Design a protein around this ligand. Structure first.
Ligand code: LNN
Ligand code: ZN
Ligand code: ZN
Length: 585
C-alpha cells in the first residue's frame, strides 16, 4: 500500500516534523494509522442561535427537536465518536456470483448513461466560476492566486506519472492549497458527472439530479402510476462505509468512454485517491489535540466531488440487482456461483432494464423503487450480500413498502398533493415542522452582525414561502420575519447545501412572483398557466395533515403568538433601526 500513499504521508511527516509522533494508543482498527501531529481546537459543541428567527418563533422555545438542533458536536471529540460507529468497520466481500451480476449490471448501466453524452474534462474556469458564485472566502483567494494553479499543475504532472503527493481528504495556505487543489483535480477528472447532468432524470431514468425539491413529489406521483407492487424506500445503514472495493472497480469502468488524456487523469483519481486514500482526522488527547494520518482501500470519501454521482450510480445498479432477484432472475445458487451464466442477466437488462430504471427515483444512497410485484420485499440475498444492509431492521425481515406515494420518504421529505381553490393540483414537499423551525433558528458559525443574522433569517422565511407555504405556522412565521427585516436587504448565506435546493428564495424579488414562476409557469405538471394573484389563493395542507406533520395550530400558545406577533416584529424592527420595512401580516 505504501507505494501509492507513501509520498503523501512523507510530505505531511516532513511538514509537521516538529510534532510528528506515533501514538501507540490510537483508536483505529480497520484503517491503517501512520502517525500524528499537534493542532489547535477546531469545531464547537453547540451552534449559534439566530436571534431574529428565535424572537419570531416563541412557541418553539419549548420544543425538544428545536433544542436538539441547537447543539451538534463538531469538536475533535465529536469527530472521534461518529468515526468508531460505522467508519471503523469492514464490509464482508460479496460472493462470486454477486460480483459477476454487479459487473454485468455496471457495464450495461455505464453504456446506458453514456448513450448521448461523452465524458469530458472540467476546467480551471468552471471551478473558478463555481467557487465565485458559491462564495457570494479563502477558497476565492486561492482561485485568484496564480501560485495555487501552479501547484495544481505540479500535482497533475505527478498524476500523469501515476503518482500522488498532496491529495489528502479531511474528516496556513500550504496545506489548504493542497486540499482545494486535490478537489480541483478530482473536479477536473470526474466533474462532468455533475456539470453535464449524467444523473438527470432524462439521462439516467432513475436519477433526479438538477430536478429540484419542488419536482421530487411530482416524480414520485408519476412512479406511482406504473403498474406493480408497493413503493419501497429502504434506508442503508451508513452507505458510504458500505462502498466495497468491488463497487469502486465497477464505478471505474466509466474511464472506458473517455478520451486518452481524460482517461489518464480519471484513472489517477480512481486508483490513487478513491481505491487508495490518505485521510486527516482530528483527535483529542490528555496532552491536547492531534491530527491522525490514516488510510484504507475501500469506502467512500463523503466530502468528494464524485461522491453523489458514484453513489447514485452504485445505488441504481444495486436496485436493478434487487429487482432481478425479486423477479426470480437471480437465485441463492446464482449468487454463490463463480461460473454464473451471463445470458439471463444480459437478456433482462436489454429487454427490461430501462423500464426497470423508470420505476425508481435514486438520489445518492436515497432510493424509491416500485417493483413489478411485492416479491422484492423479501428479495434480500443480493442486497445484503452487496453490503447494502438496511438500517434498523433484522437482515432477513421483509421490507415494508407503501401503497400511497404520499407516505413514501425520500430526501428527508414526503410529498402531499394539494387541491387549490381553483381546482388545480399541486404536489408539495413536506417534513416534520420542528426540523424546519429548528434548522432556521441556527446561524452558521459566530461573529455575525444583526444585519447578517436577519438576512439569513429572511433566506429561511423565503425558502418557507416557496417550498413550505402550505404549512400554516411557516407561512405566518415567514410573513413575520419578512415584515421584521428591511425589504431591500438581500438574503445572504445559504439555508442548505442540499443538491435539491435551487435557492429561488435568495432574492429581493416579490415572493408571490417567484412562487408563480416555480409552481405555475415553469412547472411541467401544471397544464393551466393561470397566475395566482394573491397568497389567499396559495393553498395550505388540510388542517389535520398540517397537525399530523407537526403544526401547533389549535394550541393556545400558538393563538397567543399569532395574536401578538406584530409586537415581536416591532421589537426586531426597533433593534434593526430606521430602515424601509413592509408589513406582510
Ligand atoms: O438533500 C437532501 O437529502 C434533503 C434536504 C435536506 C435539507 C434541505 O434544506 C432540503 C431542501 C429544502 C428546501 C429546498 C430544497 C432542498 C433538502
Ligand atoms: Zn494527488
Ligand atoms: Zn407533511
Amino acid at each position: 500500500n505504501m507505494d501509492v500513499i507513501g509520498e503523501r504521508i512523507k510530505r505531511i511527516k516532513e511538514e509537521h516534523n516538529s510534532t510528528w509522533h506515533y501514538d501507540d494508543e490510537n483508536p483505529y482498527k480497520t484503517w491503517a494509522y501512520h502517525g500524528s501531529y499537534e493542532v489547535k481546537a477546531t469545531g464547537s459543541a453547540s451552534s449559534m442561535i439566530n436571534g431574529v428567527v428565535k424572537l419570531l418563533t416563541k412557541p418553539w422555545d419549548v420544543v425538544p427537536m428545536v433544542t436538539q438542533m441547537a447543539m451538534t458536536d463538531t469538536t475533535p471529540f465529536g469527530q472521534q465518536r461518529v468515526f468508531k460507529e460505522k467508519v471503523d468497520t469492514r464490509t464482508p466481500r460479496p460472493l462470486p456470483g454477486t460480483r459477476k451480476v454487479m459487473e454485468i449490471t455496471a457495464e450495461w448501466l455505464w453504456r446506458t448513461l453514456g448513450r448521448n453524452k461523452r465524458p469530458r474534462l472540467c476546467t480551471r474556469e468552471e471551478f473558478t466560476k463555481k467557487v465565485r458564485t458559491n462564495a457570494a472566502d479563502s477558497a476565492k483567494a486561492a482561485v485568484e492566486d496564480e501560485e495555487f494553479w501552479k501547484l495544481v499543475d505540479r500535482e497533475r504532472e505527478l498524476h500523469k506519472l501515476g503518482k500522488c503527493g498532496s491529495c489528502v481528504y479531511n474528516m496556513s495556505r500550504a496545506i489548504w492549497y493542497m486540499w482545494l487543489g486535490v478537489r480541483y483535480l478530482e473536479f477536473e477528472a470526474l466533474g462532468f458527472l455533475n456539470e453535464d447532468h449524467w444523473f438527470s432524470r432524462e439521462n439516467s431514468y432513475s436519477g433526479v439530479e438538477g430536478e429540484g425539491l419542488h419536482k421530487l413529489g411530482y416524480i414520485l406521483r408519476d412512479i406511482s402510476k406504473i403498474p406493480g407492487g408497493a413503493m419501497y424506500a429502504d434506508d442503508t445503514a451508513g452507505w458510504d462505509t458500505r462502498i466495497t472495493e468491488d463497487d469502486l472497480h465497477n464505478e471505474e469502468k466509466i474511464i472506458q468512454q473517455m478520451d486518452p488524456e481524460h482517461r489518464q487523469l480519471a484513472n489517477a483519481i480512481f486508483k490513487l485517491t478513491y481505491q487508495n486514500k490518505v485521510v486527516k482526522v482530528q483527535r483529542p488527547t490528555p496532552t491536547g489535540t492531534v491530527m491522525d494520518i490514516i488510510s484504507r482501500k475501500d469506502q467512500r470519501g463523503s466530502g468528494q466531488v464524485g461522491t453523489y454521482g458514484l453513489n447514485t450510480f452504485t445505488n441504481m445498479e444495486a436496485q436493478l440487482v434487487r429487482q432481478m432477484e425479486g423477479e426470480g432472475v437471480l437465485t441463492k445458487a446464482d449468487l454463490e456461483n463463480p461460473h454464473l451464466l451471463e445470458k439471463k442477466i444480459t437478456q433482462w437488462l436489454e429487454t427490461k432494464g430501462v423500464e426497470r430504471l423508470k420505476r425508481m427515483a435514486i438520489s445518492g444512497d436515497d432510493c424509491v423503487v416500485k417493483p413489478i410485484d411485492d416479491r422484492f420485499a423479501n428479495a434480500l440475498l443480493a442486497l445484503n450480500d452487496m453490503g447494502k444492509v438496511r438500517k434498523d431492521i433484522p437482515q432477513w425481515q421483509p421490507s415494508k413498502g407503501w401503497h400511497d406515494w404520499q407516505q413514501v420518504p425520500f430526501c428527508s421529505h414526503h410529498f402531499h398533493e394539494l387541491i387549490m381553490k381553483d381546482g388545480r393540483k399541486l404536489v408539495v414537499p413536506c417534513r416534520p415542522q420542528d426540523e424546519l423551525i429548528g434548522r432556521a433558528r441556527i446561524s452558521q458559525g459566530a461573529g455575525w452582525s444583526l444585519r447578517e443574522t436577519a438576512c439569513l433569517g429572511k433566506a429561511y422565511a423565503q425558502m418557507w414561502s416557496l417550498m413550505y407555504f402550505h404549512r400554516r405556522d411557516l407561512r405566518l412565521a415567514s410573513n413575520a420575519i419578512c415584515s421584521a427585516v428591511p425589504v431591500h436587504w438581500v438574503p445572504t448565506s445559504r439555508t442548505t447545501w442540499s443538491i435539491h435546493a435551487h435557492h429561488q428564495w435568495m432574492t429581493t424579488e416579490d415572493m408571490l412572483t417567484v412562487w408563480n414562476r416555480v409552481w405555475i409557469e415553469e412547472n411541467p405538471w401544471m397544464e393551466d398557466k393561470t397566475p395566482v394573484t394573491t397568497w389567499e389563493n396559495v393553498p395550505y395542507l388540510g388542517k389535520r395533515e398540517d397537525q399530523w406533520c407537526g403544526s401547533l395550530i389549535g394550541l393556545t400558545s400558538r393563538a397567543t403568538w399569532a395574536q401578538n406577533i406584530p409586537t415581536a416584529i416591532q421589537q426586531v424592527r426597533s433593534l434593526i433601526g430606521n430602515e424601509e420595512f413592509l408589513d406582510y401580516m
